[PDB]
């Protein structure tokens, strides 16, 4: 028993980040095979890059992997990331696919400065296309991933900080999560809402592991439960939500509706100077198939 | 910015897990250079383990690393942990010392089942000598470690859960955590506390990272101080506390008493609804160190 906010172990990773130096300018880069992926924003000197891609040779890129120098023999953007080609493939690649994910969706960051892994922790994505990360200067390119069996799905590579203190970033064919660029004009976060279908999953990991205080006689239709969700800044939950609640429903005897009932009298109600696994609020950054994964024993390798 | 509960990168560590099978019982043993640590209660079937073990051939234990079966040639029982010799060094073995850790540091646990690696958290020893960890059946023999440069300490193997959903386990010389021993009998943890120089760490945290709300105009003396902090289950803070803080209060402008006296007044008025670094609870699993790695960018390798 016990529930952690529990990080993918990061070693597969971590043999992939590397040091990517140009001007004066040095962030994290992610070594595949033989091509190097890391922020455009590398490039020297509101910005056009493909104009200023267009003046750099190959020899203005200083990629550093480990104590060993790489040479990169090509280069070309997507998108808001550079691809850097380098002569040698990297022999510790494990098997990974480029993955695209879902406002809701979680995933674990190996922050990262001068190529050299610094923590892992996990994330959500945000509804407002946001994280909210723990990052520094230096950690652009660090990458946030799943691993499902043996392979890495990546899904996020940091780009900036927004006043908020917020973080923004793109998938790692370069697109951005949300309305941002990589400019530095005046940019800010959407109004956030929290991930109803992850509270849900939560306080089914609650129950899982023996916490029930919560949990009432009550019950509610979808309509009449997202009638009070939109007052209190909850995601809407729809019935493909309800659907894949269904085998945390059916392992604890706790019907979706009914669940929903508790979240809305404790969303009404507040704790009352009560936690739910540890925490005197309601956490939305694990998704159902996080809490599957941390209370039935799922691995990967 | 941002501040989230972070693990070291784990990598270092997975490298090392190994599957220990003997009899019908299946654990976690952790392989470096050419011993596999592991729990003692491997042993087959109040047991007396010195008895136990003298009955044990080295071809009783099967060790699994990867898909290679590693050959036991010698074993012997420290405390509670075998040591089984095998015939091949791990070539990925880092550079490692054992430690025993003192109650209030912290450390990443890399959750293992079968000597597969399932997830890394970040977790504290309690003043209680148990940790709140994230743990299920097959778990035993997984390990808690800090990371210095590129040396991996290891201070945690994990044995047994409690009644109460808490976790214990012994140094990697396979001495306990606190009065627990490795028997089915009847134990409890003692009564736990709040590890009061972690939160003023965490609070220290709040202020680098722009939270300010909580301070206040007062101050307070130690001994004032520490009448508070018992009344409501807090360990005294010491003048080494206070010491171990300074850089904290020397980077942010605020006298350790008088973060003292804004814990204090968060001590007796609550939190009236408001919340530090995302939670609603006063948090005390990050150390002084900690703070200062997270929020100024201190990387390993
Ligand atoms: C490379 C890096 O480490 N990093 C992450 C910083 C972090 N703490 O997460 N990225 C950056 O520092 C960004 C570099 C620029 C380079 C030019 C292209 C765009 C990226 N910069 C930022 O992240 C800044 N954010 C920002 O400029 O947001 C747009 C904006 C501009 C002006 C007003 C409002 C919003 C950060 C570092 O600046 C602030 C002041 C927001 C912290
Ligand atoms: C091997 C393993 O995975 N693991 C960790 C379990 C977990 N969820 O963290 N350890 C064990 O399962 C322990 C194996 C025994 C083998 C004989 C020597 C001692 C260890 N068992 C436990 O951890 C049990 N705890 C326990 O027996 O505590 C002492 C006790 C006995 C009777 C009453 C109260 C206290 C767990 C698995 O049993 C309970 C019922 C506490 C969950």
Request: proline letters at 4%.
């Amino acid at each position: 028993s016990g529930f952690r906010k529990m990080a993918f172990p990061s070693g597969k990773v971590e043999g992939c980040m590397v040091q990517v130096t140009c001007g004066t300018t040095t962030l994290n880069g992610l070594w595949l095979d033989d091509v190097v992926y890391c922020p455009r924003h590398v490039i020297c000197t509101n910005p056009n890059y493909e104009d200023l891609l267009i003046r750099k040779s190959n020899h203005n890129f200083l990629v550093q992997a480990g104590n060993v120098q790489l040479r990169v023999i090509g280069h070309s953007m997507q998108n808001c990331v550079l691809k850097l080609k380098v002569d040698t493939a990297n022999p510790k690649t494990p098997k990974y696919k480029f993955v695209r994910i879902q406002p809701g969706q979680t995933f674990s960051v190996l922050a990262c400065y001068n190529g050299s892994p610094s923590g892992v922790y996990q994330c959500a994505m945000r509804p407002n296309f946001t994280i909210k990360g723990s990052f520094l200067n230096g950690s652009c390119g660090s990458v946030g991933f799943n691993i499902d069996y043996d392979c890495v799905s990546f899904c996020y590579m940091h780009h900036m900080e927004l006043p908020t203190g917020v973080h923004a970033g793109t998938d790692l064919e370069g697109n951005f999560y949300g309305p941002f660029v990589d400019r530095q004009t005046a940019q800010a976060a959407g109004t956030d809402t929290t991930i109803t279908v992850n509270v849900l999953a939560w306080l089914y990991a609650a129950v899982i592991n023996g916490d029930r205080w919560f949990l009432n006689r009550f019950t509610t239709t979808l309509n009449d439960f997202n009638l009070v969700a939109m007052k209190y800044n909850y995601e809407p939950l729809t019935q493909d939500h309800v659907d894949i609640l269904g085998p945390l429903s059916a392992q604890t005897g706790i019907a979706v509706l009914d669940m929903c009932a508790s979240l809305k009298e404790l969303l009404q109600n507040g704790m009352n100077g009560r936690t739910i696994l540890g925490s005197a609020l309601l956490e939305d950054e694990f998704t159902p198939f996080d809490v599957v994964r941390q209370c039935s024993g799922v691995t990967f390798q």
